[PDB]
Coordinates of C-alpha atoms in Angstrom, one line a residue:
Chain A
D1 CA 0.0 0.0 0.0
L2 CA 0.8 3.7 -0.7
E3 CA 1.7 4.9 2.8
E4 CA 4.2 2.0 3.3
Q5 CA 5.7 2.4 -0.2
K6 CA 6.0 6.2 0.5
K7 CA 7.9 5.6 3.8
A8 CA 10.1 2.9 2.3
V9 CA 11.1 5.2 -0.7
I10 CA 11.8 8.2 1.6
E11 CA 14.1 6.2 4.0
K12 CA 15.8 4.8 0.8
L13 CA 16.5 8.4 -0.4
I14 CA 18.0 9.3 3.0
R15 CA 20.2 6.2 3.2
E16 CA 21.5 6.6 -0.3
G17 CA 22.2 10.4 0.0
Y18 CA 19.6 11.6 -2.4
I19 CA 18.1 13.9 0.2
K20 CA 19.5 15.0 3.6
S21 CA 17.8 18.3 4.8
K22 CA 14.9 18.2 7.2
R23 CA 12.7 20.6 5.1
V24 CA 13.2 18.4 1.9
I25 CA 12.6 15.1 3.8
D26 CA 9.4 16.6 5.4
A27 CA 8.2 18.2 2.2
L28 CA 8.5 14.8 0.5
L29 CA 6.7 13.0 3.4
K30 CA 3.8 15.5 3.3
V31 CA 3.1 16.1 -0.4
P32 CA 0.6 13.4 -1.5
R33 CA 2.2 12.5 -4.9
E34 CA -0.8 10.3 -5.8
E35 CA -3.1 13.3 -5.9
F36 CA -1.1 14.7 -8.9
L37 CA -1.3 11.5 -11.0
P38 CA -4.1 10.4 -13.4
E39 CA -6.3 7.6 -11.8
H40 CA -4.7 4.7 -13.6
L41 CA -1.2 5.6 -12.5
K42 CA -2.0 6.5 -8.9
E43 CA -1.1 3.0 -7.6
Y44 CA 2.5 3.7 -8.8
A45 CA 2.7 6.9 -6.8
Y46 CA 5.8 5.8 -4.7
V47 CA 7.6 3.7 -7.4
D48 CA 10.8 5.7 -7.8
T49 CA 10.5 6.2 -11.5
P50 CA 9.3 8.8 -14.0
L51 CA 5.7 8.5 -15.3
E52 CA 4.0 9.8 -18.4
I53 CA 1.3 12.3 -17.3
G54 CA 0.1 13.4 -20.8
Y55 CA 1.2 15.2 -23.9
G56 CA 4.5 13.3 -23.8
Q57 CA 5.5 15.0 -20.5
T58 CA 6.5 13.1 -17.3
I59 CA 6.4 13.5 -13.5
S60 CA 10.2 13.0 -12.6
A61 CA 11.4 10.1 -10.4
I62 CA 11.0 10.8 -6.7
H63 CA 14.8 10.6 -6.2
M64 CA 15.2 13.3 -8.9
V65 CA 12.7 15.7 -7.3
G66 CA 14.4 15.1 -3.9
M67 CA 17.9 15.6 -5.2
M68 CA 16.9 18.7 -7.2
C69 CA 15.4 20.2 -4.0
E70 CA 18.6 19.6 -2.2
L71 CA 20.9 21.0 -4.9
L72 CA 18.7 24.1 -5.2
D73 CA 19.5 25.1 -1.5
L74 CA 16.0 26.5 -0.8
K75 CA 15.0 28.5 2.3
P76 CA 11.7 29.6 3.8
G77 CA 10.4 32.8 2.3
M78 CA 12.1 32.5 -1.1
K79 CA 10.6 33.4 -4.4
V80 CA 11.2 30.6 -6.9
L81 CA 10.6 30.2 -10.6
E82 CA 9.9 26.6 -11.9
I83 CA 10.0 26.1 -15.6
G84 CA 7.8 23.1 -16.5
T85 CA 4.8 22.6 -14.2
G86 CA 3.8 19.2 -15.6
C87 CA 1.4 17.6 -13.1
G88 CA 2.3 20.2 -10.4
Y89 CA 4.0 17.8 -8.0
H90 CA 7.5 19.3 -7.9
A91 CA 5.9 22.8 -7.7
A92 CA 4.1 21.5 -4.6
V93 CA 7.2 20.1 -3.0
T94 CA 9.0 23.4 -3.7
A95 CA 6.0 25.3 -2.1
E96 CA 6.3 23.2 1.1
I97 CA 10.0 24.0 1.5
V98 CA 9.6 27.8 1.0
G99 CA 6.5 27.9 3.1
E100 CA 3.6 30.3 3.3
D101 CA 5.7 33.5 3.1
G102 CA 7.5 32.2 0.0
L103 CA 6.2 32.1 -3.6
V104 CA 6.5 29.6 -6.4
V105 CA 5.9 30.8 -10.0
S106 CA 5.5 27.9 -12.5
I107 CA 5.3 28.1 -16.3
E108 CA 3.7 25.4 -18.3
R109 CA 3.8 25.3 -22.1
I110 CA 0.7 22.9 -22.4
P111 CA -2.6 24.6 -21.4
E112 CA -4.4 21.4 -20.6
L113 CA -1.6 20.4 -18.3
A114 CA -1.5 23.8 -16.5
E115 CA -5.3 23.7 -15.9
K116 CA -5.2 20.3 -14.3
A117 CA -2.1 21.1 -12.1
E118 CA -3.9 24.3 -11.0
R119 CA -7.0 22.3 -9.9
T120 CA -4.9 19.8 -7.9
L121 CA -2.9 22.6 -6.2
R122 CA -6.2 24.4 -5.3
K123 CA -7.8 21.3 -4.0
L124 CA -4.8 20.6 -1.7
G125 CA -4.6 24.2 -0.4
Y126 CA -1.3 25.4 -2.1
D127 CA -2.1 29.1 -2.1
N128 CA 1.5 30.2 -2.7
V129 CA 1.9 28.7 -6.2
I130 CA 1.0 30.5 -9.3
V131 CA 0.9 28.5 -12.6
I132 CA 0.9 30.5 -15.8
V133 CA 0.8 29.2 -19.4
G134 CA 3.6 30.5 -21.5
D135 CA 7.0 29.9 -23.0
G136 CA 9.1 29.2 -19.9
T137 CA 12.5 29.6 -21.8
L138 CA 11.7 33.4 -21.4
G139 CA 11.2 32.9 -17.7
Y140 CA 8.7 35.2 -16.1
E141 CA 9.7 38.8 -16.0
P142 CA 6.6 40.3 -14.4
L143 CA 7.5 38.6 -11.0
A144 CA 11.3 38.6 -11.3
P145 CA 13.9 38.6 -9.7
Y146 CA 14.0 35.2 -8.3
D147 CA 16.1 33.7 -5.4
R148 CA 16.0 30.3 -7.1
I149 CA 15.1 29.0 -10.6
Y150 CA 14.9 25.5 -11.9
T151 CA 13.5 23.7 -15.0
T152 CA 12.0 20.2 -15.0
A153 CA 12.8 19.9 -18.8
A154 CA 16.1 20.0 -20.6
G155 CA 17.2 22.9 -22.9
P156 CA 20.0 22.9 -25.4
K157 CA 21.4 25.8 -23.4
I158 CA 20.8 27.8 -20.3
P159 CA 18.3 30.4 -21.5
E160 CA 19.6 33.9 -21.1
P161 CA 16.3 35.1 -19.6
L162 CA 16.7 32.7 -16.7
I163 CA 20.1 34.1 -15.8
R164 CA 18.9 37.7 -16.2
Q165 CA 16.0 37.0 -13.9
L166 CA 18.1 35.6 -11.1
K167 CA 18.8 37.8 -8.0
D168 CA 22.5 38.4 -7.2
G169 CA 23.5 35.4 -5.1
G170 CA 20.6 33.5 -6.8
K171 CA 21.0 29.9 -8.1
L172 CA 19.6 28.1 -11.2
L173 CA 19.4 24.3 -11.5
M174 CA 18.5 22.8 -14.9
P175 CA 19.3 19.9 -17.2
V176 CA 21.1 21.2 -20.3
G177 CA 22.0 19.3 -23.4
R178 CA 21.1 19.3 -27.1
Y179 CA 22.1 15.6 -27.2
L180 CA 23.3 13.9 -23.8
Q181 CA 22.3 16.1 -20.8
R182 CA 24.0 17.3 -17.6
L183 CA 22.3 18.7 -14.5
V184 CA 23.9 22.2 -14.0
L185 CA 23.8 24.4 -11.0
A186 CA 24.6 28.1 -11.7
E187 CA 25.1 30.7 -9.1
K188 CA 25.1 34.5 -9.8
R189 CA 27.9 36.6 -8.1
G190 CA 28.4 40.1 -9.4
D191 CA 29.3 39.9 -13.1
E192 CA 30.2 36.3 -12.8
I193 CA 28.2 33.0 -13.0
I194 CA 29.7 29.9 -11.3
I195 CA 28.5 26.8 -13.0
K196 CA 28.8 23.3 -11.4
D197 CA 28.3 20.0 -13.2
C198 CA 26.0 17.8 -11.1
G199 CA 26.0 14.7 -13.2
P200 CA 24.3 13.1 -16.3
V201 CA 20.5 13.0 -16.4
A202 CA 17.8 12.6 -19.0
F203 CA 14.7 14.8 -19.0
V204 CA 12.2 15.6 -21.8
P205 CA 13.0 18.5 -24.1
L206 CA 12.4 22.1 -23.1
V207 CA 10.7 23.6 -26.1
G208 CA 10.5 27.4 -26.7
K209 CA 12.1 30.5 -28.2
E210 CA 15.2 30.1 -26.0
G211 CA 15.2 26.3 -26.0
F212 CA 14.4 23.5 -28.5
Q213 CA 12.6 24.2 -31.7
Chain B
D1 CA -16.3 21.8 -29.5
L2 CA -15.2 25.3 -28.4
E3 CA -18.9 25.9 -27.6
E4 CA -18.9 22.6 -25.6
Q5 CA -15.8 23.7 -23.7
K6 CA -17.3 27.1 -23.0
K7 CA -20.4 25.6 -21.4
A8 CA -18.3 23.0 -19.7
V9 CA -15.9 25.5 -18.1
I10 CA -18.8 27.9 -17.0
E11 CA -20.5 24.9 -15.4
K12 CA -17.2 24.0 -13.7
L13 CA -17.0 27.6 -12.3
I14 CA -20.5 27.4 -10.9
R15 CA -19.7 24.2 -9.1
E16 CA -16.3 25.3 -7.9
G17 CA -18.1 28.4 -6.5
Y18 CA -16.3 31.2 -8.4
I19 CA -19.5 32.5 -10.1
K20 CA -23.1 32.3 -9.0
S21 CA -24.9 35.4 -10.3
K22 CA -27.2 35.0 -13.3
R23 CA -25.8 38.2 -14.9
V24 CA -22.2 37.0 -14.4
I25 CA -22.9 33.5 -15.7
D26 CA -24.8 35.0 -18.8
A27 CA -22.0 37.4 -19.5
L28 CA -19.4 34.6 -19.5
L29 CA -21.6 32.5 -21.8
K30 CA -22.0 35.4 -24.2
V31 CA -18.6 37.1 -24.7
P32 CA -16.7 35.3 -27.5
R33 CA -13.4 35.0 -25.6
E34 CA -11.6 33.6 -28.7
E35 CA -12.1 36.9 -30.5
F36 CA -9.8 38.6 -28.0
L37 CA -7.0 36.0 -28.3
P38 CA -4.1 35.8 -30.8
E39 CA -4.5 33.2 -33.5
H40 CA -2.4 30.4 -32.0
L41 CA -4.2 30.7 -28.6
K42 CA -7.8 30.8 -29.9
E43 CA -8.1 27.0 -29.6
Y44 CA -7.4 27.5 -25.9
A45 CA -10.0 30.1 -25.3
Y46 CA -11.9 28.0 -22.7
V47 CA -9.0 26.4 -20.9
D48 CA -9.2 27.8 -17.4
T49 CA -5.7 29.3 -16.6
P50 CA -3.6 32.4 -16.5
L51 CA -2.1 32.8 -20.0
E52 CA 0.7 34.9 -21.5
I53 CA -0.6 36.5 -24.6
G54 CA 2.0 39.0 -25.8
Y55 CA 3.5 42.4 -24.9
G56 CA 4.2 41.3 -21.3
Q57 CA 0.6 40.7 -20.6
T58 CA -0.7 37.8 -18.7
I59 CA -4.5 37.5 -18.8
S60 CA -6.3 36.1 -15.7
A61 CA -7.9 32.7 -15.7
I62 CA -11.6 32.8 -16.6
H63 CA -12.3 31.8 -13.0
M64 CA -10.6 35.0 -11.8
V65 CA -12.5 37.2 -14.2
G66 CA -15.8 35.6 -13.0
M67 CA -14.9 35.9 -9.3
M68 CA -13.9 39.6 -9.8
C69 CA -17.2 40.3 -11.6
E70 CA -19.0 38.7 -8.5
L71 CA -17.0 40.5 -5.9
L72 CA -17.5 43.8 -7.7
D73 CA -21.3 43.7 -7.1
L74 CA -22.2 45.2 -10.5
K75 CA -25.7 46.3 -11.6
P76 CA -27.3 47.3 -14.9
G77 CA -26.7 50.9 -15.8
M78 CA -23.5 51.4 -13.8
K79 CA -20.5 53.5 -14.9
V80 CA -17.4 51.4 -14.4
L81 CA -13.6 52.3 -14.5
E82 CA -11.2 49.4 -15.6
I83 CA -7.5 50.0 -15.3
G84 CA -5.6 47.8 -17.6
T85 CA -7.5 46.9 -20.8
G86 CA -5.2 44.2 -21.9
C87 CA -6.8 42.5 -24.9
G88 CA -10.2 43.9 -23.9
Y89 CA -11.9 40.6 -22.8
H90 CA -12.6 41.6 -19.2
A91 CA -14.0 45.0 -20.4
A92 CA -16.4 43.1 -22.7
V93 CA -17.5 40.9 -19.7
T94 CA -18.0 44.0 -17.6
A95 CA -20.0 45.6 -20.5
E96 CA -22.3 42.6 -20.7
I97 CA -23.1 42.8 -17.0
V98 CA -23.8 46.5 -16.8
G99 CA -25.6 46.2 -20.2
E100 CA -26.3 48.6 -23.0
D101 CA -27.1 51.5 -20.7
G102 CA -24.0 51.1 -18.6
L103 CA -20.6 52.5 -19.5
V104 CA -17.1 51.0 -19.2
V105 CA -14.1 53.4 -19.4
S106 CA -10.9 51.3 -19.7
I107 CA -7.3 52.6 -19.4
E108 CA -4.4 51.0 -21.1
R109 CA -0.7 52.1 -20.8
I110 CA 0.4 50.4 -24.1
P111 CA -0.9 52.1 -27.2
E112 CA -0.7 49.2 -29.6
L113 CA -2.6 47.0 -27.1
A114 CA -5.2 49.7 -26.5
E115 CA -5.8 50.1 -30.2
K116 CA -6.3 46.3 -30.8
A117 CA -8.6 46.1 -27.8
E118 CA -10.7 49.1 -29.1
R119 CA -11.0 47.5 -32.5
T120 CA -12.1 44.1 -31.3
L121 CA -14.7 45.7 -29.0
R122 CA -16.0 47.9 -31.8
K123 CA -16.0 45.0 -34.3
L124 CA -18.2 43.0 -31.8
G125 CA -20.5 46.0 -30.9
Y126 CA -19.2 46.8 -27.5
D127 CA -19.8 50.5 -28.1
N128 CA -20.3 51.6 -24.5
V129 CA -16.6 50.7 -23.8
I130 CA -14.1 53.6 -24.1
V131 CA -10.4 52.6 -24.4
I132 CA -8.1 55.4 -23.5
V133 CA -4.3 55.4 -23.7
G134 CA -2.7 56.5 -20.4
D135 CA -1.5 56.2 -16.8
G136 CA -4.3 54.3 -15.2
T137 CA -3.1 55.0 -11.6
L138 CA -4.5 58.5 -12.1
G139 CA -8.0 57.1 -13.0
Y140 CA -10.0 59.1 -15.4
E141 CA -11.3 62.4 -14.1
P142 CA -13.1 63.5 -17.3
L143 CA -15.7 60.8 -16.9
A144 CA -16.5 61.6 -13.5
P145 CA -17.3 59.5 -10.5
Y146 CA -17.7 55.8 -11.1
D147 CA -20.1 53.4 -9.5
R148 CA -17.4 50.7 -9.6
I149 CA -13.6 50.6 -10.2
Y150 CA -11.2 47.7 -10.7
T151 CA -7.7 47.0 -12.0
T152 CA -6.2 44.0 -13.7
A153 CA -2.7 44.7 -12.4
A154 CA -1.3 44.9 -8.8
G155 CA -0.3 48.2 -7.3
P156 CA 1.5 49.1 -4.0
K157 CA -1.7 50.7 -2.6
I158 CA -5.1 51.7 -3.8
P159 CA -4.2 54.9 -5.7
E160 CA -5.8 58.0 -4.2
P161 CA -7.0 59.2 -7.6
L162 CA -9.1 56.0 -7.8
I163 CA -10.6 56.6 -4.4
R164 CA -11.4 60.2 -5.2
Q165 CA -13.1 59.2 -8.5
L166 CA -15.4 56.6 -6.8
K167 CA -19.0 57.5 -6.0
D168 CA -19.9 57.6 -2.3
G169 CA -21.1 54.0 -1.7
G170 CA -18.9 52.9 -4.7
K171 CA -16.8 49.7 -4.6
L172 CA -13.2 49.3 -5.9
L173 CA -11.6 45.8 -6.4
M174 CA -7.8 45.5 -7.2
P175 CA -4.8 43.4 -6.3
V176 CA -2.4 45.1 -3.8
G177 CA 1.2 44.1 -3.1
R178 CA 4.3 43.6 -5.4
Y179 CA 5.0 39.8 -5.4
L180 CA 2.9 38.7 -2.5
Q181 CA -0.4 40.3 -3.5
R182 CA -3.9 40.4 -1.9
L183 CA -7.1 41.0 -3.8
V184 CA -8.9 43.8 -1.9
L185 CA -12.5 45.0 -2.1
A186 CA -12.9 48.6 -0.8
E187 CA -16.3 50.4 -0.3
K188 CA -16.3 54.1 0.2
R189 CA -18.5 55.7 3.0
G190 CA -18.0 59.4 3.6
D191 CA -14.5 60.1 4.6
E192 CA -13.8 56.4 5.1
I193 CA -13.0 53.3 3.0
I194 CA -13.7 49.8 4.3
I195 CA -11.3 47.3 2.8
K196 CA -11.8 43.6 2.8
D197 CA -9.2 40.9 2.0
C198 CA -10.3 38.6 -0.9
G199 CA -7.4 36.2 -0.9
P200 CA -3.9 35.9 -2.5
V201 CA -3.4 36.5 -6.2
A202 CA -0.5 37.3 -8.5
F203 CA -1.2 39.8 -11.2
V204 CA 1.4 41.7 -13.4
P205 CA 2.5 45.0 -11.8
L206 CA 0.5 48.2 -12.1
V207 CA 3.0 50.8 -13.2
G208 CA 2.5 54.6 -13.1
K209 CA 2.7 57.8 -11.1
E210 CA 0.4 56.4 -8.3
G211 CA 1.5 52.8 -8.7
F212 CA 4.8 50.9 -9.0
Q213 CA 7.5 53.4 -10.2
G214 CA 8.6 52.7 -13.7

């Protein structure tokens, strides 16, 4: 059953070093992942694997969500930009970590996906997440600058808009790769960006003006 | 199918509790939202979600337009001030609710956007909607006191020009805050305003002399 599988997968993530922070651990224990899945996939809510959720988009594996949350070095009260809402799950886990005084802005290219994610987030009480349909490779200037930015889809490059929209000291985490893809963490300092390679990954293409055709 | 989607989303909004008034429900059923949208988005006209449309504009979900129409407590015959025309869809919805003997004055900062909104409204017969290019944080003195006032963009405060231009007993609905925003409903009574919190929202910023500075 779900609650046992959930617990099992969370202790696994801790043991293996995927997650280590209390807020990340608690966020993953609280968010009901099943609520974000189509009926027929709900029974697989705590199988640590990606799932197709429609329109050729996926919810990421739980270990990837957890690891991304850790790498992103989030804090209560932050304003975060998520590129790629999908089913809304990762946006909800981000919202738990930043808490009620924080804000998550989330851009989704597929209108039908954004509408469903918005309903799930409403239903569950996530009143600090705003999902907007648009081309996420341009970020979202009306609410910028952001403390933290991440994408759940891989671009052939880091879009310039995402860097420009980052606060000084801000950090951006995204998979990048026209072919094979690496998870990159970029930190803004002054007129420099520090980029760290965080390992090979494989996410669905980020499509837009500053991403894939 | 667009027609099916239209009926389906309005019925969704009734059941979610966003809309309940016959005049609001009828206005949402009537205005052809697709006319106001760029060609590639027309097919999405009845998908309920904020949507980036162009020119740094994000239009509100249909549910937010409905809920705002309800909160604003409109009646046939009212004179209404809208700050932030956008593509002109919300102004058309307002125009339906106040009806042919009401008026909507709508202020838009961006001239190209204002001109397209005016032409869509005029093409469709919304001829008691005036689109004016200008700084909406200053309201619109020439057309007097308004029964109702609202904005489609968040400011740091309710601008004093909007309060001055409101009839006694009038209501103003607008988002207040920069990033963390509240939708507030203000009623004027004498030398007072009564302000009610209507929940969190996240509109684009309202920029101008009595709003967010450049």
